[PDB]
Write a protein that binds this ligand. Structure first.
Ligand SMILES: OC[C@H]1O[C@H](O[C@H]2[C@H](O)[C@@H](O)[C@@H](O[C@H]3[C@H](O)[C@@H](O)[C@@H](O[C@H]4[C@H](O)[C@@H](O)[C@@H](O[C@H]5[C@H](O)[C@@H](O)[C@@H](O)O[C@@H]5CO)O[C@@H]4CO)O[C@@H]3CO)O[C@@H]2CO)[C@H](O)[C@@H](O)[C@@H]1O
Ligand SMILES: OC[C@H]1O[C@H](O[C@H]2[C@H](O)[C@@H](O)[C@@H](O[C@H]3[C@H](O)[C@@H](O)[C@@H](O[C@H]4[C@H](O)[C@@H](O)[C@@H](O)O[C@@H]4CO)O[C@@H]3CO)O[C@@H]2CO)[C@H](O)[C@@H](O)[C@@H]1O
Length: 476
């Protein structure tokens, strides 16, 4: 009797490229590419297990632009310059960026502490601030090559900074290739999502928000978004075909978000399998075991992630000693294995790039130990998505209806239903009536609604500028 374990690491960034200037207004695609997007699948070169990945098409577009030397990244321009040439505004943004990240373990450099305690920075100090901000985001692969620079800790030169930037762009240039390689080698499946990561259930039927939050107030959706929902899926299929030369048969629904109409759309577009969240299972089905392969209306296969295991990796284990977090994780899998009489399928699904910066050494001790341990367990078999879809010796059940929601409490309240978030939907509704191009699709991405109407925070006003610029461009 085996336990089947399926990791599905989801990778996404919203479009940071302002449409009128072409400038990338935040550097997060660059920093996660150098730190996570190459290195997460690259673990498969060193560990003989299966790991799966989701890449959103909008993320792929941006990785391609950086790899081509085309991305004008305003924050990275401030890192690259000699400090004698830094604008006052650029020094302020470098300091604000450092303060935003200062408590994360990847920023654990004594020199950063000294610099943030200084009243004014000279050129030598600013070079250290620029270079240490770069080095903080070093991925696993380059942490071996750049160990001497990482350990130097201070007194960085412009030449060393440029050397680091050159190595980082080499990683970016190899990033889409490593996803293709591990797919071609059978070491993992690669999925995609509807193109700009929207909330498909809302686009298809905004009234589905009342299924979990009947008392919510939403704007007047006086225009149809149903064709846009189809377009996000169709354009993603085309991007997937451009990258991999096949059409996809599985997709990750953004924010695990499903509804009856969304599941029907995925099936109509040729998707045979997806996963979603355990809370939606509990809201929809009586006997909510997350360890079965479900068939929605006997048409599309659906797995529900184990929320507890997914949340331990995402939120708990960054603060544990790596060996003890791995022992806890394996121990919980053993309890699942002993609790059921069939072979359970355990989906662990979460963002693949956002939790590691809170772990010691960017999660490398934890993941190396976790993967090395899984390599050895006879009663655990890690699976690709294709293998999970086809596995015959697993338990199955039919589901006839789901309650629409997301992986945030099984409802939509982080994206709609308060005054500020509703204002974004009102804007989008009005612009859709006059839309002329696919920037209306960019503006449908979930990220804009997520950041809106929350407690003020550094750089989050950039998301508002991007959203509104895409809305404006969509009508021209
Ligand atoms: O205490 C306040 C607040 O602090 C922290 O929030 C701040 C972060 O610490 C800080 O890092 C910064 O967050 C950045 C983030 O680092 C950056 O990478 C970018 O985030 C991207 C994700 O990287 C990307 O994967 C994608 O995330 C999606 C994800 O794909 C999807 O599955 C799902 O989980 O929703 C996510 C959000 O849509 O996109 C986002 C960008 O949309 O940008 C972030 C904002 O600049 O700034 C944070 C706030 O200032 C804590 O993390 C937070 O819990 C605390 O409340
Ligand atoms: O408090 C600041 C914290 O920042 C870090 O939290 C990160 C996680 O590490 C990332 O993994 C990601 O979290 C995602 C998460 O991956 C995804 O599962 C989803 O989380 C759901 C959650 O499963 C569900 O139980 C419920 O609580 O709703 C959540 C929200 O929809 O979405 C998360 C948010 O994008 O990002 C968060 C914040 O970026 C760090 O781990 C924290 O400990 C740190 O203190």
């Amino acid at each position: 009797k085996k336990l089947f374990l399926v990791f599905w690491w989801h990778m996404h960034q919203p479009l940071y490229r302002e449409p009128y200037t072409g400038e990338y207004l935040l550097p997060w695609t660059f920093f996660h590419a150098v730190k996570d997007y190459y290195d997460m699948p690259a673990y498969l070169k060193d560990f003989e297990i299966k790991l799966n990945f989701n890449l959103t098409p909008v993320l792929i577009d941006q990785i391609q632009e950086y790899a081509q030397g085309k991305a004008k990244d305003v924050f990275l321009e401030a890192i690259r310059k000699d400090p004698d040439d830094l604008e006052k505004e650029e020094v302020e943004k470098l300091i604000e960026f450092t303060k935003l990240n200062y408590e994360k373990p990847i920023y654990r450099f004594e020199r950063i502490r000294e610099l943030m305690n200084k009243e004014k920075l000279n050129r030598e100090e600013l070079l250290d601030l620029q270079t240490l901000n770069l080095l903080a985001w070093c991925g696993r692969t380059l942490r071996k090559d750049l160990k001497d620079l990482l350990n130097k800790g201070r007194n960085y030169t412009q030449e060393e900074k440029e050397y680091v930037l050159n190595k980082y762009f080499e990683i970016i240039k190899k990033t889409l290739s490593i996803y293709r390689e591990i797919k071609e080698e059978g070491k993992g499946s690669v999925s995609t999502s509807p193109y700009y990561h929207p909330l498909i259930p809302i686009l298809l039927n905004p009234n589905c928000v009342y299924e979990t939050t009947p008392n919510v107030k939403i704007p007047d959706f006086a225009v149809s978004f149903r064709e846009d929902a189809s377009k996000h899926v169709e354009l993603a299929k085309e991007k997937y075909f451009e990258i991999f030369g096949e059409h996809p048969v599985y997709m990750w629904p953004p924010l695990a978000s499903v509804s009856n109409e969304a599941l029907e759309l995925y099936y109509e577009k040729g998707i045979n399998m997806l996963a979603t969240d355990e809370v939606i299972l509990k809201n929809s089905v009586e006997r909510a075991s997350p360890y079965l392969r479900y068939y929605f209306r006997e048409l599309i296969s659906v797995f529900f992630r184990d929320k507890t295991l997914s949340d331990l990796i995402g939120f708990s284990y960054h603060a544990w000693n790596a060996e003890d977090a791995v022992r806890d994780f394996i121990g919980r899998l053993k309890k699942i294995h002993e609790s059921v009489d069939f072979q359970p399928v355990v989906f662990v699904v979460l963002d693949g790039e956002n939790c590691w910066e809170y772990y010691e050494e960017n999660g490398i001790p934890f993941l190396e130990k976790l993967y090395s341990t899984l390599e050895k367990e006879e009663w655990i078999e890690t699976l690709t998505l294709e293998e999970a879809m086809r596995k015959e010796d697993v338990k199955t059940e039919v589901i006839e209806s789901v309650k629409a929601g997301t992986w945030f409490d099984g409802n939509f309240l982080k994206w709609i239903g308060n005054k500020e978030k509703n204002e974004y939907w009102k804007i989008l509704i009005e612009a859709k009536k006059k839309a002329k191009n696919d920037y209306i699709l960019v503006a449908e991405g979930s990220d804009w609604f997520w950041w809106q109407g929350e407690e003020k925070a550094p750089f989050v006003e950039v998301f508002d500028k991007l959203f509104r610029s895409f809305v404006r461009r969509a009508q021209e």
